[PDB]
Paper text:
Initially, fragment 8 was separately merged with fragments 6 and 7 to give compounds 9 and 10, respectively. The merged compounds exhibited moderately improved IC50 values of 11 ± 4 μM and 16 ± 4 μM (9 and 10, respectively) and maintained high ligand efficiencies (≥0.50). X-ray crystallography showed that compounds 11 to 14 all maintained the binding mode of 8. The anomalous density maps of 9 and 10 showed that bromine was only bound in the αD site, with ATP clearly bound in the active site (ESI† Fig. S2).
Residue numbers in the entry: 3 to 329
C-alpha cells in the first residue's frame, strides 16, 4: 500500500504536550452570556456557519459572531480547542467568547473584529513591498500554529483578514484546522479547490503542516502573476491536470512512485505528458512590477509535488524575498 510519511518539523509537539491540549473531545466548554452581544448585520453564510457583525455591549466594541449550523457544530470542540490553544499567537484571530445562540440552539463563537480592507481592493492594489510584508505576517501565523501542533488546512485569501491602514493581518476560519499526529490518516476533503495540494488530489491521507505551504504558494502565485486563481481546475481532477501543466508530469509520477500511491485510473485519459514550465513563462507587462528573481525562487520552493520537499514556514521566513521587509 502507500508508504507512510511524517512531517520533517514539529513531529513531537502533541506527544510532549499534555493530553488535555489535543484531546478536544474531553474539553469542557466554558459558556459565556449570549445577552452581551447585539447582532448588527449578517456578513455571510458559508456551508457551516452564518457570520454576523455584532456589538459587545459590555465595552461597546465591534465583534464578529459565527453561529454554527446544526450539521456541523459536532466538530465545535475541535475548533474551540484550537482557537483556545492558539489564542494570543502572532496574527491569529482572537476568540473572545463562546455562547449558546438562543435561536439556533447551537454554539456561537465570538471573535475580535478586524476592519478588513475590501478583498478586491487588496488583490488589485497591494504593491510588491506590501505582498512581501503581508506574506511575512502570514508566515508568522503559520509557523506559530505548526509549532503548536496544528495545521490550518484552509489557507486561502478569504481566510486572511488585512486591515491595511494599521498594517494588521489575521488568519481566520479555523473550522477545518486539525491537530497533527504523526502517522494519522486525515480526510483529503479539506481546503478550497484552487488551494488543494497534490497530496489531497492524489488521495494521500498521511499529510501534514506542509499542505498549508502549498496553499500559501498558490496565493502567492495568484498575487504576483495577476492570475486568479493560479491553478484554475474545473473540478478536483482537472485541478491536478492544471498543476501538471505547470510543474510537469514526470515529477508527478516520481511523487506517486516515492509514496507508492495508486493513482485514480480517471487520470490516465486526462493527465497527458507535460514538461515543467520555467516561472518566467508567466511574466508579462501587467505583472512585471510584482515579479523578481527572489519571488520566483521562493515560489518554486513552495510549489513542489513532494510535500516533504517544500519549505517549512520558518525556513520560508529566512528567504531572500523577505530581506527588503522592515523587521
Ligand atoms: N474577525 C472577523 N472580522 C471581520 N470579518 C470577519 C471576521 N471573521 C469572519 N469575517 C467575515 O465573515 C465571513 C465568514 O468568515 P469565516 O467563515 O470564518 O471565513 P471565510 O468565510 O473567509 O472562509 C467572511 O465574509 C469574513 O470576511
Ligand atoms: N489574493 C488576494 C488578496 C488577499 C487577501 N488576503 C491576503 C493575504 C495576503 Cl498575505 C496577500 Br499577499 C494577499 C491577500
Amino acid at each position: 500500500g502507500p508508504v507512510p510519511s511524517r512531517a520533517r518539523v514539529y513531529t513531537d509537539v502533541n506527544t510532549h504536550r499534555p493530553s488535555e491540549y489535543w484531546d478536544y473531545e474531553s474539553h469542557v466548554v466554558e459558556w459565556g452570556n449570549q445577552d452581551d452581544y447585539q447582532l448588527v448585520r449578517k456578513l455571510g453564510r458559508g456551508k457551516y456557519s452564518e457570520v454576523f457583525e455584532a456589538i459587545n455591549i459590555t465595552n461597546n466594541e465591534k465583534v464578529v459572531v459565527k453561529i454554527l449550523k446544526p450539521v456541523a457544530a459536532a466538530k465545535i470542540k475541535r475548533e474551540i480547542k484550537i482557537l483556545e490553544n492558539l489564542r494570543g499567537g502572532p496574527n491569529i484571530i482572537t476568540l473572545a467568547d463562546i455562547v449558546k445562540d438562543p435561536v439556533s440552539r447551537t454554539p456561537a463563537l465570538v471573535f475580535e473584529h478586524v476592519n478588513n480592507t475590501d478583498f478586491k481592493q487588496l488583490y488589485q492594489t497591494l504593491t510588491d513591498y506590501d505582498i512581501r510584508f503581508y506574506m511575512y505576517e502570514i508566515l508568522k501565523a503559520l509557523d506559530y500554529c505548526h509549532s503548536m501542533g496544528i495545521m490550518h488546512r484552509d489557507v486561502k485569501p478569504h481566510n486572511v483578514m488585512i486591515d491595511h491602514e494599521h498594517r494588521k493581518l489575521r488568519l481566520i476560519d479555523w473550522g477545518l484546522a486539525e491537530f497533527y499526529h504523526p502517522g494519522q490518516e486525515y480526510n483529503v476533503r479539506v481546503a478550497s479547490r484552487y488551494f488543494k495540494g497534490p497530496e489531497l488530489l492524489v488521495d494521500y491521507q498521511m499529510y501534514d503542516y506542509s499542505l498549508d505551504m502549498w496553499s500559501l504558494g498558490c496565493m502567492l502565485a495568484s498575487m504576483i502573476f495577476r492570475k486568479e486563481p493560479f491553478f484554475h481546475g474545473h473540478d478536483n481532477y482537472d485541478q491536478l491536470v492544471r498543476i501538471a501543466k505547470v510543474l510537469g508530469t514526470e515529477d508527478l509520477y516520481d511523487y506517486i512512485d516515492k509514496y507508492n500511491i495508486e493513482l485514480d485510473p480517471r487520470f490516465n485519459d486526462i493527465l497527458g505528458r507535460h514538461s515543467r514550465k520555467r516561472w518566467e513563462r508567466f511574466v508579462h507587462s501587467e505583472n512585471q512590477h510584482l515579479v523578481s528573481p527572489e519571488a520566483l525562487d521562493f515560489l518554486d520552493k513552495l510549489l513542489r509535488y513532494d510535500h516533504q520537499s517544500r519549505l517549512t514556514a520558518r525556513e520560508a521566513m529566512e528567504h531572500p524575498y523577505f530581506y527588503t521587509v522592515v523587521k
